[PDB]
Design an enzyme around this catalytic site. Sequence first.
Site, PDB file in Angstrom:
ATOM      1  CG  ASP A 155      -7.362   8.457 -25.499  1.00 25.60           C
ATOM      2  OD1 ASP A 155      -6.407   7.673 -25.629  1.00 25.60           O
ATOM      3  OD2 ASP A 155      -8.476   8.045 -24.931  1.00 25.60           O
TER       4      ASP A 155
ATOM      5  CE  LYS B  14      -6.933   0.347 -26.394  1.00 26.77           C
ATOM      6  NZ  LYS B  14      -6.880   0.807 -24.858  1.00 26.77           N
TER       7      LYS B  14
ATOM      8  CB  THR C 113      -4.354   2.032 -22.610  1.00 27.64           C
ATOM      9  OG1 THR C 113      -4.261   1.878 -24.057  1.00 27.64           O
ATOM     10  CG2 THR C 113      -5.503   2.867 -22.236  1.00 27.64           C
TER      11      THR C 113
ATOM     12  NE  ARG D 279      -7.138  -5.146 -19.918  1.00 18.08           N
ATOM     13  CZ  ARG D 279      -7.128  -5.340 -21.050  1.00 18.08           C
ATOM     14  NH1 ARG D 279      -6.421  -5.924 -22.065  1.00 18.08           N
ATOM     15  NH2 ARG D 279      -8.040  -4.655 -21.779  1.00 18.08           N
TER      16      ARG D 279
ATOM     17  CE1 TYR E 258      -4.488   1.210  -0.199  1.00 22.59           C
ATOM     18  CE2 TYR E 258      -4.697  -0.991   0.792  1.00 22.59           C
ATOM     19  CZ  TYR E 258      -5.036  -0.128   0.156  1.00 22.59           C
ATOM     20  OH  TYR E 258      -6.156  -0.278  -0.297  1.00 22.59           O
TER      21      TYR E 258
ATOM     22  CD  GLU F 119      -4.638   5.266  -0.047  1.00 23.75           C
ATOM     23  OE1 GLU F 119      -4.583   4.339   0.327  1.00 23.75           O
ATOM     24  OE2 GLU F 119      -5.378   6.079   0.012  1.00 23.75           O
TER      25      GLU F 119
HETATM   26  C1  LIG Z   1      -5.353  15.680   0.485  1.00 26.87           C
HETATM   27  O1  LIG Z   1      -5.621  16.256   1.966  1.00 26.87           O
HETATM   28  C2  LIG Z   1      -6.441  15.513   2.533  1.00 26.87           C
HETATM   29  C3  LIG Z   1      -6.163  13.903   2.808  1.00 26.87           C
HETATM   30  C4  LIG Z   1      -5.753  12.854   1.898  1.00 26.87           C
HETATM   31  C5  LIG Z   1      -5.392  11.600   2.769  1.00 26.87           C
HETATM   32  C6  LIG Z   1      -5.229  11.795   4.106  1.00 26.87           C
HETATM   33  C7  LIG Z   1      -5.309  11.121   5.290  1.00 26.87           C
HETATM   34  C8  LIG Z   1      -4.293  11.419   6.489  1.00 26.87           C
HETATM   35  C9  LIG Z   1      -4.142  10.434   7.285  1.00 26.87           C
HETATM   36  C10 LIG Z   1      -3.364  10.696   8.255  1.00 26.87           C
HETATM   37  N1  LIG Z   1      -2.651  11.083   9.256  1.00 26.87           N
HETATM   38  C11 LIG Z   1      -4.648   9.148   7.111  1.00 26.87           C
HETATM   39  C12 LIG Z   1      -5.526   8.725   6.154  1.00 26.87           C
HETATM   40  C13 LIG Z   1      -6.006   7.391   6.032  1.00 26.87           C
HETATM   41  C14 LIG Z   1      -5.189   6.326   6.735  1.00 26.87           C
HETATM   42  C15 LIG Z   1      -5.327   4.879   6.577  1.00 26.87           C
HETATM   43  C16 LIG Z   1      -3.720   6.225   5.985  1.00 26.87           C
HETATM   44  C17 LIG Z   1      -7.412   7.439   7.173  1.00 26.87           C
HETATM   45  C18 LIG Z   1      -6.994   7.745   8.369  1.00 26.87           C
HETATM   46  N2  LIG Z   1      -6.558   7.961   9.618  1.00 26.87           N
HETATM   47  C19 LIG Z   1      -8.577   7.295   6.783  1.00 26.87           C
HETATM   48  N3  LIG Z   1      -9.439   7.064   7.616  1.00 26.87           N
HETATM   49  O2  LIG Z   1      -8.672   6.696   5.386  1.00 26.87           O
HETATM   50  C20 LIG Z   1      -7.975   6.783   4.349  1.00 26.87           C
HETATM   51  N4  LIG Z   1      -8.097   6.494   3.094  1.00 26.87           N
HETATM   52  N5  LIG Z   1      -6.879   6.754   2.513  1.00 26.87           N
HETATM   53  C21 LIG Z   1      -5.985   6.884   3.588  1.00 26.87           C
HETATM   54  C22 LIG Z   1      -4.493   7.105   3.019  1.00 26.87           C
HETATM   55  C23 LIG Z   1      -6.584   6.847   4.606  1.00 26.87           C
HETATM   56  C24 LIG Z   1      -5.655   9.489   5.222  1.00 26.87           C
HETATM   57  S1  LIG Z   1      -5.717  13.478   4.523  1.00 26.87           S
HETATM   58  C1  LIG Z   2      -8.836   5.805 -27.363  1.00 28.59           C
HETATM   59  C2  LIG Z   2      -9.198   4.747 -26.076  1.00 28.59           C
HETATM   60  N1  LIG Z   2      -9.105   5.420 -24.813  1.00 28.59           N
HETATM   61  C3  LIG Z   2      -9.256   4.659 -23.916  1.00 28.59           C
HETATM   62  C4  LIG Z   2      -9.782   3.381 -23.454  1.00 28.59           C
HETATM   63  C5  LIG Z   2      -9.868   2.465 -22.133  1.00 28.59           C
HETATM   64  O1  LIG Z   2      -9.073   1.862 -22.009  1.00 28.59           O
HETATM   65  P1  LIG Z   2      -9.588   0.480 -20.830  1.00 28.59           P
HETATM   66  O2  LIG Z   2     -10.519  -0.411 -21.570  1.00 28.59           O
HETATM   67  O3  LIG Z   2      -8.314   0.059 -20.321  1.00 28.59           O
HETATM   68  O4  LIG Z   2     -10.100   1.286 -19.830  1.00 28.59           O
HETATM   69  C6  LIG Z   2      -9.845   2.491 -25.073  1.00 28.59           C
HETATM   70  C7  LIG Z   2     -10.367   1.016 -25.201  1.00 28.59           C
HETATM   71  N2  LIG Z   2     -10.552   0.706 -26.610  1.00 28.59           N
HETATM   72  C8  LIG Z   2     -11.491  -0.240 -26.930  1.00 28.59           C
HETATM   73  C9  LIG Z   2     -10.699  -1.003 -28.046  1.00 28.59           C
HETATM   74  O5  LIG Z   2     -10.213  -0.396 -28.963  1.00 28.59           O
HETATM   75  O6  LIG Z   2     -10.917  -2.192 -28.221  1.00 28.59           O
HETATM   76  C10 LIG Z   2      -9.686   3.457 -26.127  1.00 28.59           C
HETATM   77  O7  LIG Z   2      -9.716   3.030 -27.513  1.00 28.59           O
HETATM   78  C1  LIG Z   3     -12.800   0.777   3.716  1.00 33.64           C
HETATM   79  C2  LIG Z   3     -12.374   1.096   2.446  1.00 33.64           C
HETATM   80  N1  LIG Z   3     -12.820   0.948   1.337  1.00 33.64           N
HETATM   81  C3  LIG Z   3     -12.195   1.338   0.206  1.00 33.64           C
HETATM   82  C4  LIG Z   3     -10.561   1.545   0.098  1.00 33.64           C
HETATM   83  C5  LIG Z   3     -10.129   1.632  -1.358  1.00 33.64           C
HETATM   84  O1  LIG Z   3      -9.324   0.603  -1.639  1.00 33.64           O
HETATM   85  P1  LIG Z   3      -8.262   1.046  -2.996  1.00 33.64           P
HETATM   86  O2  LIG Z   3      -7.138   1.548  -2.191  1.00 33.64           O
HETATM   87  O3  LIG Z   3      -7.998  -0.281  -3.500  1.00 33.64           O
HETATM   88  O4  LIG Z   3      -8.982   1.830  -3.962  1.00 33.64           O
HETATM   89  C6  LIG Z   3      -9.718   1.527   1.287  1.00 33.64           C
HETATM   90  C7  LIG Z   3      -8.390   1.706   1.200  1.00 33.64           C
HETATM   91  N2  LIG Z   3      -7.836   1.300   2.759  1.00 33.64           N
HETATM   92  C8  LIG Z   3      -6.507   2.353   3.048  1.00 33.64           C
HETATM   93  C9  LIG Z   3      -6.025   1.750   4.272  1.00 33.64           C
HETATM   94  O5  LIG Z   3      -6.880   1.170   5.187  1.00 33.64           O
HETATM   95  O6  LIG Z   3      -4.680   1.235   4.312  1.00 33.64           O
HETATM   96  C10 LIG Z   3     -10.549   1.131   2.496  1.00 33.64           C
HETATM   97  O7  LIG Z   3      -9.930   1.202   3.724  1.00 33.64           O
END
Ligand SMILES: COCc1ccc(-c2cc(C#N)cc([C@@]3(C(C)C)C(C#N)=C(N)Oc4n[nH]c(C)c43)c2)s1
Ligand SMILES: Cc1ncc(COP(=O)(O)O)c(CNCC(=O)O)c1O
Ligand SMILES: Cc1ncc(COP(=O)(O)O)c(CNCC(=O)O)c1O
Lengths: 442, 442
Positions: A208, A237, A234, A243, A54, A56
């Site tokens: 694009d 292709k 992308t 992907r 992870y 982020e």
């Molecule tokens: C761009 O500014 C606003 C923000 C984006 C992510 C922020 C963030 C800060 C902290 C701290 N300290 C923590 C988190 C946490 C944790 C799990 C890392 C976090 C916490 N605590 C929660 N609740 O959810 C999250 N989603 N994604 C991330 C990175 C988080 C998120 S604040």
């Molecule tokens: C110009 C263009 N942009 C974006 C995408 C989206 O990519 P993802 O499918 O990875 O989300 C495609 C998919 N193209 C469909 C095809 O030509 O078969 C595309 O042709």
């Molecule tokens: C409850 C919850 N839902 C959705 C997501 C989104 O997952 P992706 O990062 O795969 O988009 C997270 C990520 N969790 C951040 C953490 O707990 O470290 C999460 O904790």
Amino acid sequence: MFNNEPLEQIDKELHDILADEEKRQRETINLIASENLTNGAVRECLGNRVSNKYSEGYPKKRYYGGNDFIDKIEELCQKRALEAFNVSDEEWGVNVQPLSGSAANVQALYALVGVKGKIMGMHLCSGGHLTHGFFDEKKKVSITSDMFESKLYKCNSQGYVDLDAVREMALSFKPKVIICGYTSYPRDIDYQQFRQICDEVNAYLFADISHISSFVACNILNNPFLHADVVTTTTHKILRGPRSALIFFNKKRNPGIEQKINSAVFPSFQGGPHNNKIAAVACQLKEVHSPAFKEYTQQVLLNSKALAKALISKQIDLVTNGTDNHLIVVDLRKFSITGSKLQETCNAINVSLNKNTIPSDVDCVSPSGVRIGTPAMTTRGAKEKDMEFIADVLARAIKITVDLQEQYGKKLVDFKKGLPGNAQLQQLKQEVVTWAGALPFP
Amino acid sequence: MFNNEPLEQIDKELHDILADEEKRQRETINLIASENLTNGAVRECLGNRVSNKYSEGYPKKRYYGGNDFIDKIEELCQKRALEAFNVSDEEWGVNVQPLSGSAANVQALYALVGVKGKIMGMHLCSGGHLTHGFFDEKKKVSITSDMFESKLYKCNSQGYVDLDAVREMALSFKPKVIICGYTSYPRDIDYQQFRQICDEVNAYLFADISHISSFVACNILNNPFLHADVVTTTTHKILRGPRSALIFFNKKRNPGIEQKINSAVFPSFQGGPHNNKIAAVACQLKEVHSPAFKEYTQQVLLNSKALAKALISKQIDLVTNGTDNHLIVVDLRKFSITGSKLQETCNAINVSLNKNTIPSDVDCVSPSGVRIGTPAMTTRGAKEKDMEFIADVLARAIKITVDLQEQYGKKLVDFKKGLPGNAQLQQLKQEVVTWAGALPFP
Ligand SMILES: COCc1ccc(-c2cc(C#N)cc([C@@]3(C(C)C)C(C#N)=C(N)Oc4n[nH]c(C)c43)c2)s1
Ligand SMILES: Cc1ncc(COP(=O)(O)O)c(CNCC(=O)O)c1O
Ligand SMILES: Cc1ncc(COP(=O)(O)O)c(CNCC(=O)O)c1O
Ligand SMILES: COCc1ccc(-c2cc(C#N)cc([C@@]3(C(C)C)C(C#N)=C(N)Oc4n[nH]c(C)c43)c2)s1
Ligand SMILES: [Cl-]
């Protein structure tokens, strides 16, 4: 406290299907314009433990400990991306975190315009993508038509972009973004012309280049980076990567775009990056910049020209009457058959393709064309000489399709009844498998 | 016409960083609550050629030929998904295409409410996700606060979901969705209670169980499926799958929701599915349903209980004073240090964790806690007895952090000056590496 048995032993049911899929791939003439075949190196990356992490945020600015090597991997990728498209890291920046093209595009547009923002794209029936603002009367099909306000420009009856129509529309509509670069467009793009139109209405230029990315890198087609504010592509292709997607932004044309784009990818839309993707992209990007990949890309166009030529020599109509790139759209109207039926016929003979609209089409479900492309077969070592054979195989599939429509009728369900056990199809599939099975397979 | 040299030979620079990352992973005490380690089978899937295929649409309803084996894999995944969460395919449906948790959530929310739609979620500082409608006074941080209109409920000063507040907010704001299930919430959830509030106000019930998915499956914690309209979960966390997400929808409660969710994933948001992801999710879901994975999941809680117990025995404060699950949040206020500093110190000793907010926190850049979790270490075979050691290691890091703050100051940049070469840290890291390096490693 885990199971370490290999896939075959741990999940025999799933392993069989995957072995089946592998075999089908090895034995198909793959003409899907958006498909390719990754090397072992790219698949070793996708399979790597780097996806455990992870991470982020951005390199040096993570929200987790243990990201030292992940930072090196993310930065090397950004480095190699800017290298691959011959842009100075001083003028151009790149985000390597979008999970796929559809995501990257939605992210990039929002960064530029925000919610309810105005965008202009090419229509789906004309060769544009879903993520270029597509809707129909009945529904807002793409989010790009809903979270944004969009208007759609069509190509002319000949199938070319009508820049006049583009300008006419831009002056009345006043969009913040105009999108060019396409999904099933067989011709090159006048980027400079688009730039002059954007300049008039103070709009961003969005290119694009997902379909044509390798051409842009190897300097074989027009370079959108000379004029564009935003470039997306992308990686799966013609680029022959995994992907994933890339967002390029011109820092010099637009200060503070870097933050705008980066904050749109995270934390506006995505969470944790997929580090196995990023690693795989990095690996392929090294290959993209070599003189050897330029050769591959040249061969893609050589093959596509020859295939267009050979299809024309057999009385098959092409949209725009040829191609400037890897892709062709066949107009099947003269045969009174649909792309849908030709798709089923080709699948029955192990030819991978897709149904596609043509300019005159009004039906998304029953199109008058099929779209074909060369990148996959070019990857498999096919040359210009081999193109007549594919051309011949398609011609025969078209004939067989006309016959089967005669026998079973116009309904798609009725039509499919004729494919199993058909003597000519069995003969054609075997003919296909024999040649396809012998070609190099990464 | 490709390169087939293995990763080591084709890209030595990249292969080294990945081997470095692999070494770091093996020798780290991983307390990141959202992390796990996949087996080889799941990684053979992520590495499979199945990612070559473009298969936009749904099984039997594709926009490309040659999807015969891709359909089997997408169906077996849906089958195993519904199986693993003990739901009947007649009552519950699932989408297996969302690329990650953030995408799935944005997808699922749009399906239910559309653009400008009203949603309710727990605040980020209280333990909720970004994708639960999070915004700042300054900016709409998540698209979920921008494309939707959101309101945010806070837990009380003790760190528990305040249902009074939830209802009070629901009756005034009248959202179409209410979100429960969280990113850093150390307690179980009263879903039945949420359902009562959603019923009162005619709102959909959304349970995001990404953090606690294995508990729900194995029937060790409350089951949201009894009450919820929509259940989302990532697959890479406690589920120990690849990086992907699932959307579950209750058909019996909401007819026509299937089309809504499926159209939201495609073509509203995504293009071509990532078939290697789907293959990998399918593989892990078979394991989820086994009685042996129930054992692992039990161990996670046994370890988390023990670790909480042992931290309290060392005079460390926990939010809610304990845990109902895999995760703990340490309140660092009594030590006058920040999570940011404890994160750097722990990284220096090979202890992976993240800084986390607490209820009294008003700052997001510097918070008053760290979040820790047991799924990864449990995966590595660590038991309750091992937890005292991790607790001791953390206590020691906390102490070292207090010392370093005294010497170098409260500025984060100043603080980091003290980390390299510190004898106690070198001593602690070595202690960490020795024990971690010898643990079973998938
Ligand atoms: C761009 O500014 C606003 C923000 C984006 C992510 C922020 C963030 C800060 C902290 C701290 N300290 C923590 C988190 C946490 C944790 C799990 C890392 C976090 C916490 N605590 C929660 N609740 O959810 C999250 N989603 N994604 C991330 C990175 C988080 C998120 S604040
Ligand atoms: C110009 C263009 N942009 C974006 C995408 C989206 O990519 P993802 O499918 O990875 O989300 C495609 C998919 N193209 C469909 C095809 O030509 O078969 C595309 O042709
Ligand atoms: C409850 C919850 N839902 C959705 C997501 C989104 O997952 P992706 O990062 O795969 O988009 C997270 C990520 N969790 C951040 C953490 O707990 O470290 C999460 O904790
Ligand atoms: C349910 O909403 C209506 C639609 C969504 C996608 C549709 C579609 C139909 C056809 C046909 N025939 C073709 C396409 C194409 C091709 C490349 C497959 C297509 C075409 N032709 C274009 N221009 O872009 C695309 N983006 N995604 C997909 C699947 C397409 C898209 S129609
Ligand atoms: Cl992947």
